[PDB]
Amino acid sequence: TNARSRIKDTDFAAETAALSKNQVLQQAGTAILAQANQLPQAVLSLLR
Amino acid sequence: TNARSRIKDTDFAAETAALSKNQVLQQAGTAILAQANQLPQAVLSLLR
Known part of the structure; x- marks a missing residue:
């Protein structure tokens, strides 16, 4: 059982x-x- | 996709x-x- 826990526990x-x-x-x-x-939003809002 | 933009974008x-x-x-x-x-206009208006 202790092994079973070292496997699973x-x-x-x-x-x-x-x-x-x-x-x-x-x-x-x-x-x-x-x-x-927010990046592309800024890009176009400014170049326009 | 990044390539596709370097082509198109x-x-x-x-x-x-x-x-x-x-x-x-x-x-x-x-x-x-x-x-x-306006050039030809002037030319003739004056030579007349």
């Missing part, structure tokens, strides 16, 4: 950190996109 | 300048013509 005290990292990335790349999609 | 931030130049030429050569077509 996630050391989620580490995977929590991994988890935050993923949540974090979702957030960050999103905000980057909210910024990114 | 006009760097219209330059073509705007080209655009103005063309509009500009339309205007200028036109005014030149408004002047040019």
